[PDB]
Amino acid sequence: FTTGLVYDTLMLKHQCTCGSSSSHPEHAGRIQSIWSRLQETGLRGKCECIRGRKATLEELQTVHSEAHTLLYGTNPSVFVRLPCGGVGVDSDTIWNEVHSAGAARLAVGCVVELVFKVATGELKNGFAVVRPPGHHAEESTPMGFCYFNSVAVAAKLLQQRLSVSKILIVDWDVHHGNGTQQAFYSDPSVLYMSLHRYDDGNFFPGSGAPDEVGTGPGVGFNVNMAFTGGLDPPMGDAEYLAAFRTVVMPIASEFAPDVVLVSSGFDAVEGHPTPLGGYNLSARCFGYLTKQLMGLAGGRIVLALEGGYDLTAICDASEACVSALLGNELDPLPEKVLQQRPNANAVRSMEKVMEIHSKYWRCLQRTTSTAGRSLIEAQTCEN
């Protein structure tokens, strides 16, 4: 069955007026380079071309308050004059008074159109080359280059329109997705699962402690795989693959989702500036992480772009992910990755997360505690 891609050049229009491209890492060229890489590699010809649309204000209001959708979804004060000279709500999130409202709605709508085409069976899986990223946005607070939470809106719309009972949201963007967590913090029917640098709250945005397990009926359905200890050593492929083998897959498998949405951030890839990420994930590792998620929910999966700001890194990672969604055979993992053990900081983080969520997920016992094993050592003991 066909994989689907969605992309629109109107999202390029979301740009600061200052004319200083260096000051805004979330710039229009992040998706243009990605779409160009999908064309030159021939992957775009293997996928269906999905046309986007702007999200309706009622669609945005499933997640955000009406005052938030009217402030940032429409045009004729929270706005301020930035040091760069452009308008914005804060130093991070610039606002173009002409084009930005149509770009944010187009990003939410391209994700909703792709997710519904996969959920309804018009596509096997999808990948959304969309900007601005949405996972940091809250019910009324834009932040982190985010305005509307595109993944959260597509998840709420899957419930209110298709009555899906189980929805898995993986968030492997290096930053915690505070808005995707807040949107479903009390909902058993949606399992949020964020992998992020945390360092005891000393990283942006500072939320996402392992103890934050959800509330009310939704207790135990929010899994924060929070890494800690800084970049000493920085997390690599062996640490993320171990977190999937020990924490992500066992919990997602017991949840048995009907759908899998992914906040596909690429700022964890190697070569990023340290404040924006600092992890050394290979782009080839993200292709394997995509293929492991493809076994869930019958293959009903959609990846939506979030973070990731180095152009060569997000292009290599978008290529590996779409190549994985197509069923293409992966490049084999290097022997240094298969044999490397996770660093002790990643082991202390995984075991701390497993200690909290073993109370809620019965199958988080077989992996307690295999967190320190290398992938070859785990394949040895499982035989």
Partner: peptide, 12 residues
């Protein structure tokens, strides 16, 4: 006030 550009967490 923290920033995503600097990696600085939000705090009050």
């Amino acid at each position: 006030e923290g920033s995503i550009t600097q990696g600085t967490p939000l705090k009050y």
